[PDB]
Design a protein around this ligand. Structure first.
Ligand SMILES: COc1cc(-c2cncc(-c3ccc(C4CCN(C)CC4)cc3)c2C)cc(OC)c1OC
Length: 288
């Protein structure tokens, strides 16, 4: 009746970490990305698979799902997530070596805000969706597309509303001080907004103005170690209430001046004071 071609040719490893590995693969002559999960991160495969079995997200700024595969082996279970492949790699990678102009900076950050608002919004009726919070938004979990927009990846920690925790460097104050209202879905949206503000800062540093640009640095590079502890982060973000520095040179440029204001409104200590993703989008469409 029909042949179901399932062979994927794994061609090059494009990432390896505690999560497992990501490979560029080929299916029917077309590139796919294959994430092969480590045993330690099996629950991320289950959560993302459960989410996609509940709602088939389809959005230009969300990494495109293709398949979830579980294969029995002699003494283990092999778990793969298969998605669209973005050859330019992650935003984190891209910002190391690339500087941006005003148009490309805004296009990047608006595309991220668009994907995030799509996650956050509940849509009713047929072809709707539950509201979703990401819970691990960061520049390594955003991919750059050839058209200059980005897409958000890795829903392994995501939560829906109708051992894995987030990356500590990007954790909001209410996570670090354990005051987050865990029974309120809006709390998780507000944690994502904090992280979005950090990503906005990382990108804006790389936008040139008046011949000046900052080197790529991760948030809080000047105040915590590599692989900062939970306590290291809590002291900076909660006790001392530090925030990423805004360089003077941004205040000569109208775009970076507006982006600095936007960042600040993602970083309020009080989570309910932070802007929503929808409001961020509107503000970004009015810049330039
Ligand atoms: C964030 O997480 C996930 C990401 C991806 C994913 C999707 N497209 C492309 C990539 C990629 C391609 C290429 C490079 C490098 C390698 C070649 N050269 C050195 C420069 C560029 C980096 C990255 C990835 C990693 C897939 C995932 O799942 C299948 C992910 O997990 C949800």
């Amino acid at each position: 009746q029909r042949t179901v071609a399932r062979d994927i040719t794994l061609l090059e490893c494009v990432g390896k970490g505690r999560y497992g590995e990501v490979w560029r693969g080929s299916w029917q002559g077309e590139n796919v990305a294959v994430k092969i999960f480590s045993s330690r991160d099996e629950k991320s495969w289950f959560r993302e698979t459960e989410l996609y079995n509940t709602v088939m997200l389809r959005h230009e700024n969300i990494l495109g799902f293709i398949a979830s595969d579980m294969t029995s082996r002699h003494s283990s279970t092999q778990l793969w997530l298969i998605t669209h492949y973005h050859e330019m790699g992650s935003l984190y990678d891209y910002l190391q070596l690339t500087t941006l102009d005003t148009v490309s900076c805004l296009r990047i950050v608006l595309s991220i805000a668009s994907g995030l608002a799509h996650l956050h919004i509940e849509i009713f009726g047929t072809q709707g969706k539950p509201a979703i919070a990401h819970r691990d938004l960061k520049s390594k979990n955003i991919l750059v597309k050839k058209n200059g927009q980005c897409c958000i990846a890795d829903l392994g920690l995501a939560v829906m509303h109708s051992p894995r925790v987030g990356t500590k460097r990007y954790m909001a104050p209410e996570v670090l001080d354990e005051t987050i209202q865990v029974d309120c879905f809006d709390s998780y949206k507000r944690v994502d907004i904090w992280a979005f503000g950090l990503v906005l800062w990382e990108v804006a540093r790389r936008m040139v103005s008046n011949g000046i640009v900052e080197d790529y640095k991760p948030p809080f590079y000047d105040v915590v170690p590599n692989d900062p502890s939970f306590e290291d982060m809590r002291k900076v973000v909660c006790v001392d209430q530090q925030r990423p520095n805004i360089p003077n040179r941004w205040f000569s440029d109208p775009t970076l001046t507006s982006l600095a204001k936007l960042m600040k409104e993602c970083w309020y200590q009080n989570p309910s004071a932070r802007l929503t993703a929808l409001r961020i989008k509107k503000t970004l469409t009015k810049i330039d």
